[PDB]
Ligand binder design. Structure first.
Ligand SMILES: CN(C)C(=O)NN(CCCCN)C(=O)O
Ligand SMILES: *[C@@H]1O[C@H](CO)[C@@H](O)[C@H](O)[C@H]1NC(C)=O
Lengths: 10, 36, 253
Protein backbone atom coordinates (compact mmCIF):
# COMPACT_ATOMS: atom_id res chain seq x y z
CA UNK A 1 0.00 0.00 0.00
CA UNK A 2 3.00 2.24 0.20
CA UNK A 3 3.63 4.57 -2.64
CA UNK A 4 7.01 4.10 -4.22
CA UNK A 5 9.81 6.24 -2.83
CA UNK A 6 12.66 7.56 -4.88
CA UNK A 7 15.46 5.07 -5.66
CA UNK A 8 18.03 7.54 -4.42
CA UNK A 9 16.76 6.53 -0.94
CA UNK A 10 17.16 2.91 -1.56
CA UNK B 1 19.95 17.50 21.03
CA UNK B 2 19.76 17.18 24.79
CA UNK B 3 18.83 18.71 28.13
CA UNK B 4 15.52 20.54 27.80
CA UNK B 5 15.91 19.16 24.30
CA UNK B 6 17.24 21.68 21.75
CA UNK B 7 17.27 25.47 21.52
CA UNK B 8 14.43 26.18 19.23
CA UNK B 9 13.10 22.81 20.37
CA UNK B 10 9.49 22.18 21.01
CA UNK B 11 8.35 25.40 19.24
CA UNK B 12 6.36 24.51 16.12
CA UNK B 13 6.80 26.64 13.04
CA UNK B 14 3.15 26.49 12.18
CA UNK B 15 1.80 26.96 15.65
CA UNK B 16 3.92 28.42 18.49
CA UNK B 17 6.14 30.47 16.19
CA UNK B 18 3.04 32.13 14.67
CA UNK B 19 1.07 32.18 17.80
CA UNK B 20 -1.52 29.81 16.50
CA UNK B 21 -2.89 26.97 18.61
CA UNK B 22 -3.72 23.47 17.38
CA UNK B 23 -7.19 22.15 17.80
CA UNK B 24 -6.82 20.22 21.00
CA UNK B 25 -3.86 21.62 22.80
CA UNK B 26 -6.25 23.45 25.13
CA UNK B 27 -7.20 19.98 26.46
CA UNK B 28 -3.70 19.42 27.62
CA UNK B 29 -3.29 22.78 29.12
CA UNK B 30 -6.50 22.54 30.91
CA UNK B 31 -5.52 19.31 32.56
CA UNK B 32 -2.38 20.79 34.06
CA UNK B 33 -5.04 22.30 36.14
CA UNK B 34 -5.52 25.08 33.57
CA UNK B 35 -2.52 26.45 31.68
CA UNK B 36 -0.32 29.54 31.70
CA UNK C 1 -4.00 5.09 17.20
CA UNK C 2 -7.43 4.01 18.39
CA UNK C 3 -10.06 6.71 18.84
CA UNK C 4 -7.84 9.60 17.84
CA UNK C 5 -8.30 12.19 15.08
CA UNK C 6 -6.46 13.38 12.07
CA UNK C 7 -3.58 15.51 13.10
CA UNK C 8 -3.36 19.01 11.61
CA UNK C 9 -0.60 19.78 9.19
CA UNK C 10 2.67 20.53 10.96
CA UNK C 11 1.17 19.58 14.33
CA UNK C 12 3.98 17.09 15.33
CA UNK C 13 6.84 18.16 13.24
CA UNK C 14 9.11 15.87 15.27
CA UNK C 15 7.09 12.79 14.33
CA UNK C 16 9.26 10.35 12.51
CA UNK C 17 8.33 7.29 10.48
CA UNK C 18 10.52 4.19 10.84
CA UNK C 19 10.28 2.61 7.45
CA UNK C 20 11.12 -0.79 6.22
CA UNK C 21 13.10 -0.79 3.03
CA UNK C 22 12.09 -4.21 2.00
CA UNK C 23 9.38 -5.22 2.12
CA UNK C 24 8.38 -1.59 2.27
CA UNK C 25 6.50 -1.17 5.50
CA UNK C 26 5.84 1.00 8.49
CA UNK C 27 7.80 -0.46 11.41
CA UNK C 28 7.03 2.05 14.18
CA UNK C 29 7.03 5.72 15.07
CA UNK C 30 10.01 7.71 16.32
CA UNK C 31 10.90 11.30 17.14
CA UNK C 32 13.45 13.92 15.96
CA UNK C 33 15.36 15.27 18.95
CA UNK C 34 17.92 17.28 17.00
CA UNK C 35 19.06 17.60 13.45
CA UNK C 36 20.89 14.26 13.41
CA UNK C 37 19.16 12.16 16.12
CA UNK C 38 16.05 10.15 16.31
CA UNK C 39 14.58 8.55 19.42
CA UNK C 40 12.55 5.37 19.38
CA UNK C 41 11.77 2.22 21.37
CA UNK C 42 14.44 -0.49 21.45
CA UNK C 43 11.83 -3.15 20.62
CA UNK C 44 11.11 -1.55 17.33
CA UNK C 45 14.60 -2.67 16.33
CA UNK C 46 15.38 -5.71 18.54
CA UNK C 47 13.14 -8.39 19.79
CA UNK C 48 14.77 -11.81 19.75
CA UNK C 49 11.70 -13.73 20.78
CA UNK C 50 10.21 -12.89 17.39
CA UNK C 51 13.42 -12.97 15.59
CA UNK C 52 13.43 -9.22 15.17
CA UNK C 53 16.85 -7.69 14.82
CA UNK C 54 16.95 -4.60 12.57
CA UNK C 55 20.02 -3.05 11.34
CA UNK C 56 21.06 0.36 10.09
CA UNK C 57 20.90 -0.85 6.58
CA UNK C 58 17.48 -2.33 6.94
CA UNK C 59 15.77 0.92 7.58
CA UNK C 60 14.77 4.27 6.43
CA UNK C 61 13.65 7.25 8.48
CA UNK C 62 10.99 9.49 6.91
CA UNK C 63 10.44 12.92 8.42
CA UNK C 64 7.87 15.69 7.94
CA UNK C 65 5.17 13.27 6.88
CA UNK C 66 1.50 13.59 7.09
CA UNK C 67 0.04 10.97 4.80
CA UNK C 68 0.90 7.40 5.84
CA UNK C 69 1.52 5.83 2.39
CA UNK C 70 2.15 8.69 0.08
CA UNK C 71 5.60 9.82 -0.83
CA UNK C 72 5.14 13.50 0.06
CA UNK C 73 7.20 15.13 -2.64
CA UNK C 74 8.82 18.35 -1.59
CA UNK C 75 7.61 17.86 1.97
CA UNK C 76 9.06 14.81 3.58
CA UNK C 77 12.69 13.98 3.94
CA UNK C 78 14.00 10.43 3.92
CA UNK C 79 17.25 9.70 5.63
CA UNK C 80 19.56 6.97 6.31
CA UNK C 81 20.91 5.75 9.51
CA UNK C 82 24.50 6.06 10.46
CA UNK C 83 24.17 4.07 13.70
CA UNK C 84 21.72 2.53 16.11
CA UNK C 85 22.20 2.51 19.83
CA UNK C 86 20.03 0.45 22.08
CA UNK C 87 20.06 0.79 25.84
CA UNK C 88 22.66 -1.71 27.14
CA UNK C 89 20.11 -2.74 29.77
CA UNK C 90 16.92 -2.84 27.63
CA UNK C 91 15.09 -5.88 29.05
CA UNK C 92 13.50 -7.77 26.20
CA UNK C 93 13.45 -11.02 28.13
CA UNK C 94 11.07 -9.88 30.75
CA UNK C 95 9.16 -6.65 30.54
CA UNK C 96 10.74 -4.30 27.96
CA UNK C 97 12.24 -2.27 30.72
CA UNK C 98 14.38 0.48 29.28
CA UNK C 99 12.76 0.21 25.91
CA UNK C 100 14.62 3.02 24.20
CA UNK C 101 17.14 3.56 21.50
CA UNK C 102 18.80 6.30 19.56
CA UNK C 103 19.42 6.44 15.84
CA UNK C 104 22.02 8.69 14.40
CA UNK C 105 21.23 10.01 11.00
CA UNK C 106 23.66 9.72 8.21
CA UNK C 107 23.24 13.48 7.65
CA UNK C 108 21.59 16.29 9.46
CA UNK C 109 18.14 16.99 8.25
CA UNK C 110 17.06 20.52 7.59
CA UNK C 111 14.20 21.97 9.62
CA UNK C 112 11.24 23.37 7.73
CA UNK C 113 7.67 24.14 8.59
CA UNK C 114 7.06 20.35 8.77
CA UNK C 115 10.23 19.16 10.42
CA UNK C 116 11.34 20.43 13.80
CA UNK C 117 12.73 18.67 16.89
CA UNK C 118 11.01 18.17 20.19
CA UNK C 119 12.68 19.01 23.55
CA UNK C 120 13.81 16.42 26.03
CA UNK C 121 12.63 17.13 29.51
CA UNK C 122 14.78 18.40 32.35
CA UNK C 123 14.35 17.30 35.95
CA UNK C 124 12.11 20.09 36.73
CA UNK C 125 9.92 19.80 33.71
CA UNK C 126 9.49 16.12 34.52
CA UNK C 127 8.78 16.87 38.06
CA UNK C 128 6.02 19.30 37.16
CA UNK C 129 4.25 17.61 34.34
CA UNK C 130 4.57 13.96 35.01
CA UNK C 131 1.48 13.81 37.23
CA UNK C 132 -1.58 11.57 37.39
CA UNK C 133 -4.38 13.28 35.51
CA UNK C 134 -2.17 15.47 33.40
CA UNK C 135 -2.64 14.76 29.75
CA UNK C 136 -0.05 14.07 27.11
CA UNK C 137 -0.43 13.45 23.42
CA UNK C 138 0.44 10.48 21.32
CA UNK C 139 0.69 10.44 17.62
CA UNK C 140 1.20 7.83 14.97
CA UNK C 141 0.10 6.01 11.83
CA UNK C 142 -0.67 2.74 13.62
CA UNK C 143 -3.85 0.77 13.44
CA UNK C 144 -7.12 2.26 14.26
CA UNK C 145 -8.40 -0.88 15.95
CA UNK C 146 -7.10 -4.00 17.71
CA UNK C 147 -8.24 -6.30 14.80
CA UNK C 148 -10.23 -4.73 11.96
CA UNK C 149 -8.40 -0.75 9.82
CA UNK C 150 -5.55 1.68 9.00
CA UNK C 151 -5.38 5.55 8.80
CA UNK C 152 -4.66 7.68 5.75
CA UNK C 153 -3.09 10.49 7.70
CA UNK C 154 -1.21 10.92 10.92
CA UNK C 155 -3.56 10.45 13.94
CA UNK C 156 -3.52 12.01 17.35
CA UNK C 157 -4.98 11.45 20.79
CA UNK C 158 -4.55 13.10 24.16
CA UNK C 159 -4.45 10.85 27.18
CA UNK C 160 -4.11 11.26 30.88
CA UNK C 161 -1.20 9.93 32.86
CA UNK C 162 -2.37 7.30 35.36
CA UNK C 163 -1.36 6.57 38.96
CA UNK C 164 1.32 3.93 39.35
CA UNK C 165 -0.84 1.60 41.44
CA UNK C 166 -3.67 1.54 38.98
CA UNK C 167 -1.01 0.86 36.35
CA UNK C 168 0.44 -2.05 38.28
CA UNK C 169 -2.96 -3.46 39.14
CA UNK C 170 -3.92 -3.67 35.52
CA UNK C 171 -1.49 -6.22 34.48
CA UNK C 172 0.59 -9.16 35.55
CA UNK C 173 3.71 -7.74 34.03
CA UNK C 174 6.30 -6.32 36.51
CA UNK C 175 6.27 -2.50 36.00
CA UNK C 176 9.47 -0.50 36.69
CA UNK C 177 10.34 3.05 37.47
CA UNK C 178 11.41 3.34 33.82
CA UNK C 179 7.82 3.23 32.65
CA UNK C 180 4.61 5.08 33.13
CA UNK C 181 1.14 4.22 31.92
CA UNK C 182 -1.54 6.36 30.55
CA UNK C 183 -5.07 6.25 29.29
CA UNK C 184 -8.56 6.69 30.48
CA UNK C 185 -10.26 4.48 33.05
CA UNK C 186 -13.29 2.44 31.90
CA UNK C 187 -15.28 4.79 34.10
CA UNK C 188 -14.07 7.86 32.33
CA UNK C 189 -16.12 7.40 29.21
CA UNK C 190 -13.33 8.58 26.91
CA UNK C 191 -11.14 6.18 25.02
CA UNK C 192 -7.98 6.17 23.01
CA UNK C 193 -4.76 4.35 22.82
CA UNK C 194 -1.70 3.68 20.76
CA UNK C 195 -1.90 0.55 18.68
CA UNK C 196 0.07 -1.56 16.37
CA UNK C 197 2.27 0.61 14.19
CA UNK C 198 2.47 3.41 16.79
CA UNK C 199 5.21 2.03 18.99
CA UNK C 200 8.40 3.96 19.27
CA UNK C 201 6.37 7.13 18.81
CA UNK C 202 6.34 10.04 21.26
CA UNK C 203 4.15 10.85 24.14
CA UNK C 204 4.52 14.56 24.47
CA UNK C 205 3.47 17.36 26.74
CA UNK C 206 3.38 21.17 26.33
CA UNK C 207 4.96 23.14 29.20
CA UNK C 208 2.66 25.78 30.58
CA UNK C 209 5.78 27.60 31.80
CA UNK C 210 7.60 28.01 28.56
CA UNK C 211 5.21 26.95 25.80
CA UNK C 212 7.45 24.27 24.46
CA UNK C 213 6.68 20.71 23.65
CA UNK C 214 8.54 18.06 25.63
CA UNK C 215 8.67 14.36 24.96
CA UNK C 216 8.03 12.64 28.21
CA UNK C 217 7.41 9.11 26.93
CA UNK C 218 7.90 6.63 24.11
CA UNK C 219 5.04 4.34 23.05
CA UNK C 220 6.28 1.04 24.46
CA UNK C 221 3.73 -1.63 25.23
CA UNK C 222 0.21 -2.50 26.04
CA UNK C 223 -2.14 -5.48 26.13
CA UNK C 224 -4.41 -5.09 23.13
CA UNK C 225 -5.46 -1.59 22.08
CA UNK C 226 -7.90 0.57 23.84
CA UNK C 227 -9.13 -2.30 25.96
CA UNK C 228 -11.16 -1.48 29.07
CA UNK C 229 -9.18 -1.59 32.29
CA UNK C 230 -5.93 -1.73 30.37
CA UNK C 231 -3.42 1.09 29.86
CA UNK C 232 -0.60 1.99 27.63
CA UNK C 233 2.85 1.79 28.96
CA UNK C 234 5.53 4.22 27.93
CA UNK C 235 9.27 4.51 28.43
CA UNK C 236 10.12 7.25 30.97
CA UNK C 237 12.32 9.42 28.96
CA UNK C 238 13.52 11.53 31.75
CA UNK C 239 14.70 8.62 33.84
CA UNK C 240 16.72 7.55 30.94
CA UNK C 241 18.06 10.94 30.00
CA UNK C 242 21.55 10.41 31.26
CA UNK C 243 21.99 7.56 28.99
CA UNK C 244 20.69 9.75 26.17
CA UNK C 245 23.16 12.59 26.89
CA UNK C 246 25.88 10.09 27.31
CA UNK C 247 25.36 8.69 23.93
CA UNK C 248 24.94 11.93 22.13
CA UNK C 249 28.06 13.33 23.71
CA UNK C 250 30.24 10.30 23.34
CA UNK C 251 29.21 9.89 19.76
CA UNK C 252 28.13 13.01 17.91
CA UNK C 253 24.93 15.02 18.32
C1 LIG D 1 6.19 -8.68 27.26
N1 LIG D 1 5.31 -7.53 27.17
C2 LIG D 1 5.68 -6.40 28.00
C3 LIG D 1 4.32 -7.53 26.29
O1 LIG D 1 3.67 -6.53 26.05
N2 LIG D 1 4.15 -8.67 25.66
N3 LIG D 1 4.10 -8.51 24.26
C4 LIG D 1 5.40 -8.39 23.61
C5 LIG D 1 5.57 -7.43 22.42
C6 LIG D 1 6.98 -6.99 21.99
C7 LIG D 1 7.37 -7.37 20.54
N4 LIG D 1 8.37 -6.58 19.73
C8 LIG D 1 2.86 -8.39 23.75
O2 LIG D 1 1.92 -8.61 24.55
O3 LIG D 1 2.78 -8.18 22.42
C1 LIG E 1 21.53 -8.53 16.42
O1 LIG E 1 22.36 -8.64 15.24
C2 LIG E 1 23.73 -8.25 15.52
C3 LIG E 1 24.53 -8.37 14.22
O2 LIG E 1 24.09 -7.42 13.28
C4 LIG E 1 24.30 -9.22 16.57
O3 LIG E 1 25.65 -8.79 16.98
C5 LIG E 1 23.46 -9.21 17.81
O4 LIG E 1 24.10 -10.31 18.49
C6 LIG E 1 22.02 -9.55 17.46
N1 LIG E 1 21.27 -9.50 18.72
C7 LIG E 1 21.02 -10.70 19.29
C8 LIG E 1 21.07 -11.86 18.33
O5 LIG E 1 20.55 -10.72 20.43
Amino acid sequence: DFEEIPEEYL
Amino acid sequence: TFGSGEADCGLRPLFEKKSLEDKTERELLESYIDGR
Amino acid sequence: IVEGSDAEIGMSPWQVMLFRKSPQELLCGASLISDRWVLTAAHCLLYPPWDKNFTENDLLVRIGKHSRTRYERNIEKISMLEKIYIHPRYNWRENLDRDIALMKLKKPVAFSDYIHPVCLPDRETAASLLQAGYKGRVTGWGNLKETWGQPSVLQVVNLPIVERPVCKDSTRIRITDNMFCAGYKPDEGKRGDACEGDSGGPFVMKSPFNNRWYQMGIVSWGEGCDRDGKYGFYTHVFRLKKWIQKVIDQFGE
